[PDB]
Amino acid sequence: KKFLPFQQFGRDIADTTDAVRDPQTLEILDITPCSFGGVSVITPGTNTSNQVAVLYQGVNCTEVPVAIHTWRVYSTGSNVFQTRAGCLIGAEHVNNSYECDIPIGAGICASYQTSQSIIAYTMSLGAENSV
Amino acid sequence: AYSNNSIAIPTNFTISVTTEILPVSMTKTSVDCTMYICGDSTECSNLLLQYGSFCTQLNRALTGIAVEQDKNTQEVFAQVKQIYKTPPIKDFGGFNFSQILPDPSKPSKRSPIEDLLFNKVTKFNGLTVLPPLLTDEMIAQYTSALLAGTITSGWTFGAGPALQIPFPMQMAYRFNGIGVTQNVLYENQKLIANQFNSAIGKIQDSLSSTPSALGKLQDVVNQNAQALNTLVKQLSSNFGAISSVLNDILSRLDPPEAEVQIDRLITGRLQSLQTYVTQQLIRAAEIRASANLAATKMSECVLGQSKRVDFCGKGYHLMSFPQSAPHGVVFLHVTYVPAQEKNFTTAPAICHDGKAHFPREGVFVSNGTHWFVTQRNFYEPQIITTDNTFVSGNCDVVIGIVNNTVYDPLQPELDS
Amino acid sequence: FNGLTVLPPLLTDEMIAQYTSALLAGTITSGWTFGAGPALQIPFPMQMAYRFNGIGVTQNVLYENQKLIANQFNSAIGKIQDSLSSTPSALGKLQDV
Amino acid sequence: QYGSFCTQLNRALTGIAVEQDKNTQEVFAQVKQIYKTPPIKDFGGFNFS
Amino acid sequence: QSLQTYVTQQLIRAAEIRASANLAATKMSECVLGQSKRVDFCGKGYHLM
Ligand SMILES: *[C@@H]1O[C@H](CO)[C@@H](O[C@@H]2O[C@H](CO)[C@@H](O)[C@H](O)[C@H]2NC(C)=O)[C@H](O)[C@H]1NC(C)=O
Ligand SMILES: *[C@@H]1O[C@H](CO)[C@@H](O[C@@H]2O[C@H](CO)[C@@H](O)[C@H](O)[C@H]2NC(C)=O)[C@H](O)[C@H]1NC(C)=O
Ligand SMILES: *[C@@H]1O[C@H](CO)[C@@H](O[C@@H]2O[C@H](CO)[C@@H](O)[C@H](O)[C@H]2NC(C)=O)[C@H](O)[C@H]1NC(C)=O
Ligand SMILES: *[C@@H]1O[C@H](CO)[C@@H](O[C@@H]2O[C@H](CO)[C@@H](O)[C@H](O)[C@H]2NC(C)=O)[C@H](O)[C@H]1NC(C)=O
Ligand SMILES: *[C@@H]1O[C@H](CO)[C@@H](O[C@@H]2O[C@H](CO)[C@@H](O)[C@H](O)[C@H]2NC(C)=O)[C@H](O)[C@H]1NC(C)=O
Ligand SMILES: *[C@@H]1O[C@H](CO)[C@@H](O)[C@H](O)[C@H]1NC(C)=O
Ligand SMILES: *[C@@H]1O[C@H](CO)[C@@H](O)[C@H](O)[C@H]1NC(C)=O
Ligand SMILES: *[C@@H]1O[C@H](CO)[C@@H](O)[C@H](O)[C@H]1NC(C)=O
Ligand SMILES: *[C@@H]1O[C@H](CO)[C@@H](O)[C@H](O)[C@H]1NC(C)=O
Ligand SMILES: *[C@@H]1O[C@H](CO)[C@@H](O)[C@H](O)[C@H]1NC(C)=O
């Protein structure tokens, strides 16, 4: 940004402050509030299997392991997929497409197969046909 | 000009294309309760936990709303078992669907009208927006499959296996459905195709001219956005406390009075949250009703020909085509309208040999000198024979009978 | 008197009466044609024959029982005023709101 | 000090007020013209008085 | 609090009236301007007009 010489902070969103003048020196720094979001547990029937997956809704994966203060995640614990819905832990990625067994979001659906027991794929709208 | 023996019969027709716009889904949002009420403070939560499971209630309501939005979209669009595709050949006997079929040239697979609609339609306090399950490409493929099935199989693909049929024959099917014989289309195919293409061009131009017609969708977005903004504004009020900022009052005053200040703030913010949740619930109910109406229209207007008056566009209904839009569906209804009417004299029956002849399908019309039988929506006179009429009764019971001669096609053959 | 007002409706009742009269005149003198496109005149008995063919009865029935049908229709329309006025709870739906 | 409560209350009330007129117009205004019956009531025995 | 409760009740009643008005509009479009074949939609028995 460019601040006029008489200005200190800025309110682009018009209800909160998101930019400021540097306290050390005369540059300008923007402020982005610290990330957060819901945690969802994706599981098949509990009397079918115990392996599950964890979806941090709306947050990049370069962030999950070290913020929260209980179970841990471990980078090697999965492939740590990165979806448009958020960060997904505990499931692999399969190029094939099937019906939406479990709704995750943004066209991604998860299912159970007997290599992690839970897989996530892009939903298939149906078998292709031509008349 | 009403009279007891005069009718008006059309002599020409016009094919019209109208539009209808229906919102379907509303943005899915979820608000963290504790984070909104207070940010990075333990005293807030310790004083808040006295209020019970209100947070669970709010989260349950919002989750239900989001799931209902997803169900609405899935019910409205996913109505076909397969995914058809139009053949690369573009020979339909004169009709031209270039304005509604998907365009592979564009980076995103959409029809030109879909792009016209898409280009005509226009965060840190615990509130989050969740992505929908179905992206725009999925619904685009759904609409493309529906359109291809409608074009290449008529309505048969909506009841069982898809059956191919030439487009003029489907046109004759629909014309016979509305009450007009097939020969009308099979003889005015070129005019009908020209009128259809002209109507499609006109609707494209009319939609591109002004964006007010899309207001039904646009308004909805604004409403949701407003219902968010006001909420954040509620974080800038004292609610009768010393200061609207929690950190300053917490760091300024000791527990035994900062607690009453925090209680005031918590009461105000909880009231705001309850108001927002109730408003969202009511708006979601309205949107669900609209989505159910859209699903019904898609099932009946598109997958078949509706006989309900003024349900799939003004006038006699021929078909419809669906198109997608942000949070909405746009139906293009193709309908039939009589154009030019002519006066005729009328009689309910004809007395020939002491018996009354009634028309099988059609009306008796006299041009002042002779009598003919026509259909009820297109002037097409024919000689009155024993096959167009049926005999029942005598010549003295009906009121308004007329005298004329009914021709028998068998007699000249018998003489010959 | 404490900050509440009632805003008069946009459509006055005479306008509603005119709209209903227009609809009735159209459906009397032109059948169902005025709904689709331009209105076309047609004799009322022929329109009744149209409807009879619509519900699956041939039109000779009406064209031979016209006077009886007219008498029954007149009596039925006459009875509606008595059936409405005699019972003072007929309009309960609007009174409730 | 309570923020913007009654403003949104007023907004909801005016929204309902507009919906009322919208309902009436949708229900009744389905005819583009206003037709008139002929002066003579010759309907073949039927009575519309 | 009292005003908020009254406004919410009014909103619910307005939604109900909107549903009734939509039903009335559909009935006007189909039963009046045509001859509906739906059973019991425009009164008991075969519908004439
Ligand atoms: C029925 O109406 C159509 C158009 O409403 C007529 O088609 C036009 O006819 C004129 C001359 O008759 C031509 O100059 C136009 O080019 C035609 N329009 C199109 C789109 O082709 C048609 O002639 C009318 N038919 C009858 C029997 O009157
Ligand atoms: C369907 O109509 C479109 C017009 O929208 C036709 O596209 C035109 O095609 C010609 C010749 O290829 C071009 O010179 C024009 O520039 C095109 N116009 C537009 C707007 O694309 C198309 O050819 C028609 N299809 C058929 C089969 O008649
Ligand atoms: C009413 O229709 C009849 C039937 O077509 C007309 O009689 C024919 O008129 C044409 C002239 O256009 C003559 O060539 C035919 O020879 C006539 N038919 C017979 C059997 O002679 C009649 O002219 C029409 N009347 C009016 C007023 O248009
Ligand atoms: C139709 O024609 C018949 C016979 O061609 C007409 O019957 C005549 O009716 C009058 C009045 O009662 C009698 O005086 C004649 O004797 C009848 N004719 C015969 C041959 O018996 C009948 O009136 C005609 N109807 C119309 C409407 O013109
Ligand atoms: C239609 O019915 C009305 C009654 O509802 C008839 O009006 C009556 O007409 C007679 C004379 O024929 C008067 O003695 C009565 O006083 C009238 N009654 C009322 C209530 O005004 C009317 O004549 C009928 N019209 C037709 C064409 O049948
Ligand atoms: C639960 O167990 C029963 C019997 O052990 C089995 O039939 C059922 O399939 C199991 N549940 C699921 C979801 O598989
Ligand atoms: C996190 O991933 C998203 C994926 O879209 C990317 O845009 C963003 O830059 C990433 N952030 C970091 C810090 O890598
Ligand atoms: C299959 O998946 C791998 C990732 O596991 C990816 O690199 C590859 O491009 C995919 N192939 C296809 C055809 O999608
Ligand atoms: C109406 O029909 C009559 C035939 O009964 C005809 O003479 C008259 O010219 C017609 N009116 C118009 C305006 O065409
Ligand atoms: C039609 O009305 C006229 C009045 O001008 C009358 O003379 C004639 O008998 C009537 N005809 C029928 C069939 O009702």
From Swiss-Prot, chain C:
Residues 66-97 are annotated as: Heptad repeat 1. Changing N2K: In strain: Omicron/BA.1. Subunit of the fusion protein that is processed upon entry into the host cell. Mediates fusion of the virion and cellular membranes by functioning as a class I viral fusion protein. Contains a viral fusion peptide that is unmasked after S2 cleavage. This cleavage can occur at the cell membrane by host TMPRSS2 or during endocytosis by host CSTL. In either case, this triggers an extensive and irreversible conformational change that leads to fusion of the viral envelope with the cellular cytoplasmic membrane, releasing viral genomic RNA into the host cell cytoplasm. This is Spike protein S2'. It comes from Severe acute respiratory syndrome coronavirus 2.
UniProtKB/Swiss-Prot annotation, chain E:
Disulfide bonds join C31-C42. Subunit of the fusion protein that is processed upon entry into the host cell. Mediates fusion of the virion and cellular membranes by functioning as a class I viral fusion protein. Contains a viral fusion peptide that is unmasked after S2 cleavage. This cleavage can occur at the cell membrane by host TMPRSS2 or during endocytosis by host CSTL. In either case, this triggers an extensive and irreversible conformational change that leads to fusion of the viral envelope with the cellular cytoplasmic membrane, releasing viral genomic RNA into the host cell cytoplasm. This is Spike protein S2'. The gene is S.
